[PDB]
Design a protein around this ligand. Structure first.
Ligand SMILES: C[C@]12O[C@H](C[C@]1(O)CO)n1c3ccccc3c3c4c(c5c6ccccc6n2c5c31)CNC4=O
Ligand SMILES: [Cl-]
Length: 264
């Protein structure tokens, strides 16, 4: 797993340019490879053995999930302590959703590709739970294709909206695949509306409490350009954010439906 990863010396990189914020992310040129990469550096001053081992754990989890829709990892920098990864020119879905209105065909393809990546993680033996899935961690290449990133919290702030209600109900429940399915529901919501969930609201505590009783982000209306596909997606979203985790679909079931939203 960690055998193929390379150690990078900071002299190998140039043109450091901030893109991130957690930890700072930089676009770097690898001078000998004549290509750009991304490096996420630690926020602290003293990088202890706890961090350096966790960073290695983060890298090994990414390498085990090599896939078309998962962000490739190249290795670690020691000079500044950082994880070295593929560069995704277009940045995050969060930024894309806030920029301009997206055509519906692209929206459906983003949802589908995100679902196929998540399905791949849950198909591993044992399943890899992402546990931090949100528009900020869904990255886009020059042609707007998805690769899932941020494996910092994966297991074999603004995150409250993506947190399943059972995680608010139970003091430290055991993590499962149904956690990611909930977060994905809230991702669908953001793609449908181009808004951040619970953006208007004053305090988190009231909404969190209501979320435990079955409250969710307000359903969007049916769109004019693709009303049928939009209705189907709204329906799937709703099943994916059901209060009972066992009633939620699997990503196997999700990917089957999101595929039909793309094919005309
Ligand atoms: C912090 C964050 O910076 C932005 C988006 C971001 O996810 C925060 O919303 N951000 C960008 C903005 C504009 C262009 C590229 C990125 C980028 C990249 C990565 C990451 C990344 C990896 C692991 C955790 C966080 C990461 N980011 C990344 C990121 C990893 N690969 C990247 O290219
Ligand atoms: Cl339609």
């Amino acid at each position: 797993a960690l055998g193929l990863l390379r150690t990078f010396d900071a002299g190998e990189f140039a043109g450091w340019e901030k893109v991130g914020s957690f930890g700072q992310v930089y676009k770097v040129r690898h001078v000998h490879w004549k290509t750009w990469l991304a490096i996420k550096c630690s926020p602290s001053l003293h990088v202890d053995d706890r961090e350096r081992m966790e960073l290695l754990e983060e890298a090994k989890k990414m390498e085990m999930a090599k896939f078309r829709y998962i962000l490739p990892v190249y290795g670690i920098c020691q000079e500044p302590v950082g994880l070295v990864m593929e560069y995704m020119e277009t940045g995050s879905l969060e930024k894309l959703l806030a920029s301009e209105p997206l055509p519906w065909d692209l929206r459906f393809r983003i949802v589908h590709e995100t679902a196929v990546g998540m399905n791949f993680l849950h198909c591993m033996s044992p399943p890899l739970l992402h546990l931090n899935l949100k528009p900020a961690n869904i990255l886009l290449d020059a042609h707007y294709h998805v690769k899932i990133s941020d494996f910092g919290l994966a297991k074999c702030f603004g995150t409250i909206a993506y947190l399943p209600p059972e995680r608010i109900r139970e003091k430290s429940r055991l993590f499962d695949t149904k956690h990611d399915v909930y977060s994905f529901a809230i991702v669908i919501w953001g793609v449908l509306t181009q808004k951040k969930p619970f953006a208007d609201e004053k305090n988190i505590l009231h909404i969190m409490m209501k979320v435990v009783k079955g409250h969710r982000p307000e359903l969007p209306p049916i769109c004019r350009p693709r009303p049928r596909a939009c209705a189907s997606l709204i329906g799937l979203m709703q099943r994916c954010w059901h209060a009972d985790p066992q009633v939620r679909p699997t990503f196997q079931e999700i990917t089957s439906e999101t595929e039909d939203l793309c094919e005309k």
